[PDB]
Design a protein around this ligand. Structure first.
Ligand code: T3J
Ligand code: T3J
Lengths: 304, 304
């Protein structure tokens, strides 16, 4: 028992982290097979960052301008291309610790682990969600760019995120591993504002299930509701709308607890309308939305 | 910027996790050099757990009754001893992935990362504190016993915890890696109650510093206080007393923010007396106490 904000074990991703240096700029890359993936702004002076033309800036760069270091050994770059906002550096050595992997583009509400790195060395691991405004609320200092987000399915690392940017509000933006930004963000030192940071309703419901499963039951009410009635209250509280797809996904938690999804919805509705009254659920004073239904099931069943 | 509950990268500890089976009981062990460390109750039937005499139960066990599996390869046990509540199984093979390590017994308030494992396989990593009642609030199902807590100083894993027990309240108890329980707990299926779970005051202060550093400043008040005046309010709120040793340790955060420690104490005092009024600090509605001053400095400076 107990329920913790839990990241994947990071070992498989630690074995992929390299330092990439172009001129004076150093950040992290992800070495998978004979390719190193890094943010393309590695080629930029922070003067360049104000209005970079990456294609033009790239003409000035050769294979040998990209310095790739894995531990304290340099990799030979024999190839470089730009894919969207990432650089793929072909190296002459396949990463011997390459895990089985996929590149996946996740949806808002999806959670993943970040291995925060500096000079290609891991400093820490935490669990995140893609916000409904396609930002993440990370922990990232200068040099953290190239750090990646991932899920693990048994032995397969699904890489879903690469860190690129801190917005003026101190929330984070980045790309999938094909270099396409989540949201409308661009790799340019220009004021860019996030949209409404809504609560991930399906993730709150999952976590209310995790709470019941772990003995925290004080908030279970005697009410039910409908998706439409629930959604009127959701909209009012900047909660994301709940779909039959969200209800479907919560079914297994519904089964294990004997609490119908719409009953748990009615409990959430009262928690929105009444607040916590100084109480806590799983040692939180606010409703947590960075556990997916899959996360709750995984942690509640001990998947490895 | 941003501030996350952050675990150490787990890779160095993943490379140490084995499955230990004695009779029908399977849990996790920690393989360091040619020794596997596991909870001694691995020898117990849950019938044995009601009033075990471990010395007597151990007489009945030989080297070959302890089945140690690392990945899908069996290690040969050539030796076994009991040290307090752990078994040390001598194996004929040094763990080739043994990191540099220390065994350390941590103080209440000290944080560490848990790699939660099942059948010697890692399922997840989270950050904990030793509570002032020498419990931890973990996430641990059946088979999680032998999972370890650790800190990393650059390349040196300090192992501080091994999971042994869930108390009837669903909080956790375990040993240092010399097999001595944190607190008054024993490895027996007998009702054992935790003492008062106090807030780790020095850790709250650290986290208020982390908040200011990351732009959350609304709670900074115009007051200061004294350790004695602060401690009268602390005692009243089941906060641990604050010592000049806690103040000393906060000095670097004091320096970086220009907020005297006793001024931050007075801000905390008002937050206790006034509550949050529905506001949040670093996306929490309650005062976080599982970041040490060292943790805040580490994450705020990007140590690897
Ligand atoms: C994340 C990171 O390491 N850095 C340092 C180099 O680039 C910085 C940057 C990114 C985007 C941008 F628009 C300006 C600066 C962030
Ligand atoms: C933690 C774990 O895996 N287990 C399974 C086997 O032993 C269980 C146990 C420990 C202590 C106790 F007093 C009773 C049962 C916990």
């Amino acid at each position: 028992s107990g329920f913790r904000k839990m990241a994947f074990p990071s070992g498989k991703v630690e074995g992929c982290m390299v330092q990439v240096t172009c001129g004076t700029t150093t950040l992290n890359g992800l070495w998978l097979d004979d390719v190193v993936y890094c943010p393309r702004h590695v080629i930029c002076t922070s003067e360049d960052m104000l209005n970079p033309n990456y294609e033009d800036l790239l003409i000035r760069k050769s294979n040998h301008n990209f310095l790739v270091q894995a531990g304290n050994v340099q990799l030979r770059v024999i190839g470089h291309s730009m894919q969207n906002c990432v650089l793929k550096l072909k190296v002459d050595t396949a990463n011997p610790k390459t895990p089985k992997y996929k590149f996946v583009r996740i949806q808002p509400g999806q959670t993943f682990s970040v291995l925060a790195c500096y000079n290609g060395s891991p400093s820490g691991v935490y669990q995140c969600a893609m916000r409904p405004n396609f930002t993440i609320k990370g922990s990232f200092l200068n040099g953290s760019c190239g750090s990646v987000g991932f899920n693990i399915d048994y032995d397969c690392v699904s890489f879903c995120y690469m860190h690129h940017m801190e917005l003026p509000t101190g929330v984070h933006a980045g790309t999938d591993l094909e270099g396409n930004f989540y949201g409308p963000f661009v790799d340019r030192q220009t004021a860019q504002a996030a949209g409404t940071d809504t609560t991930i309703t399906v993730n709150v419901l999952a976590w209310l299930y995790a709470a019941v499963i772990n003995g925290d039951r004080w908030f279970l009410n005697r009410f039910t509701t409908t998706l439409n009635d629930f959604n009127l209250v959701a909209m009012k509280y900047n909660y994301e709308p709940l779909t039959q797809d969200h209800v479907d996904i919560l079914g297994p938690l519904s089964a294990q607890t004997g609490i119908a999804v719409l009953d748990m919805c009615a409990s959430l509705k009262e928690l929105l309308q009444n607040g916590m009254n100084g109480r806590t659920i799983l040692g939180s004073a606010l409703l947590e939305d960075e556990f997916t239904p899959f996360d709750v099931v995984r942690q509640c069943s001990g998947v490895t």
